[PDB]
Write a protein that binds this ligand. Structure first.
Ligand SMILES: N[C@@H](CCC(=O)N[C@@H](CS)C(=O)NCC(=O)O)C(=O)O
Ligand SMILES: N[C@@H](CCC(=O)N[C@@H](CS)C(=O)NCC(=O)O)C(=O)O
Lengths: 208, 208
């Protein structure tokens, strides 16, 4: 089946977990403590010396976006055709870009850079609002009329930014509605309310 | 047909260009000067306010990796099956990770951070050598026995690092052979020797 090896944080596994849960998939969580990580052996065996590590049967994957694309490809959450698959990629790459900036802030200069980051946020979120406006008036998903792996990734990005900058989505009616809508999907809603998700910190350094 | 809108640099378009050329595809280059960029209108119309911008018929794409995956998907350079597609993704994500560090060095702190970056290089390259060692002894491609978009992306990464740190591939027989082998592919070889490629700077700030 599936197994996700990660530290006890939502971080880069939040989206793939939301995906798995919403899609009714079963998976095993192999929690890696800082102690175990610092020992060195596990890290050494990781392709790029990092987590998450994912296992689908005997297929071992690394890279959160690889895991997302894999599940998307195998679970049919990658568009209806090639054009949509490309658009799904375009959205995900955008999410990744902002996620990297977020991570940089959180771990590199939260205190000094938070204000600047927040002033810049609107411009970083606008693209997704625009994508939504061009897709059935933002009444469905980020791309096409079926959910994709990019949706879960974008939803997580939006959720964590809501924590970082409460109200940041107020200026974006489509994104706000979108978040409320996806969060309301039965299985996802249940997962987001579970201790499994709720009792895990967003990041590893206690900042958010 | 195809059209790539970018600044007159290899940068993030080098891999997709190598791909297009090696695959015998025809494409139009729409060069964007710093003057034109600074005007503001073009940037404003770009989804994430950045280039490259790519056009395939009336399909407009943004994000270099999206373009790479799109061409890979439509040109059959994305693995033979889902398992390979995932591995191809894992390689590309790794390449992207190192490319971001490279770009950060080049534009953020070349002078002060070059030495540290270079000492760290071996550890950053090892994963690709390992991937090669696990795939037909590195006699073929990065994943499987057919070329993928990740190959062009990895090749570019290796080529630019050779310029940054001459000899960095000496400790890696598989990567070295791999570079020599792919660079020898007829169409690619011709492209790499063309003014189109040769007379374009690797980066926009003149560093490399
Ligand atoms: N590009 C990778 C990044 C992975 C990453 O940054 N992993 C961090 C935690 S989220 C890690 O393993 N840190 C431990 C280390 O680098 O030693 C991905 O998307 O999975
Ligand atoms: N994640 C994007 C990054 C694009 C990017 O960084 N573009 C730069 C040049 S390589 C740019 O457009 N700079 C101009 C600007 O940001 O205003 C991609 O992979 O295409």
């Amino acid at each position: 089946p599936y197994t996700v090896v990660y530290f006890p944080v939502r971080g880069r596994c939040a989206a793939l977990r939301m995906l798995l849960a919403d899609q009714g998939q079963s998976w095993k969580e192999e929690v890696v403590t800082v102690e175990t990580w610092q020992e060195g052996s596990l890290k050494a065996s990781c392709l790029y010396g990092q987590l998450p590590k994912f296992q689908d049967g005997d297929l071992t994957l690394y890279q959160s976006n690889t895991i997302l694309r894999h599940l998307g490809r195998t679970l049919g959450l990658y568009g209806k055709d090639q054009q949509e698959a490309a658009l799904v990629d375009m959205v995900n790459d955008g999410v990744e870009d902002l996620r990297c900036k977020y991570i940089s802030l959180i771990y590199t200069n939260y205190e000094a850079g938070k204000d600047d980051y927040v002033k810049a946020l609107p411009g970083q979120l606008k693209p997704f609002e625009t994508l939504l406006s061009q897709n059935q008036g933002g009444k469905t998903f980020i791309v096409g009329d079926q959910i994709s792996f990019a949706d879960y990734n974008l939803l997580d990005l939006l959720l964590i930014h809501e924590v970082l900058a409460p109200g940041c989505l107020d200026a974006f009616p489509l994104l706000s509605a979108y978040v409320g809508r996806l969060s309301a999907r039965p299985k996802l809603k249940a997962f987001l309310a579970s201790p499994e998700y709720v009792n895990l910190p967003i990041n590893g350094n206690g900042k958010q």
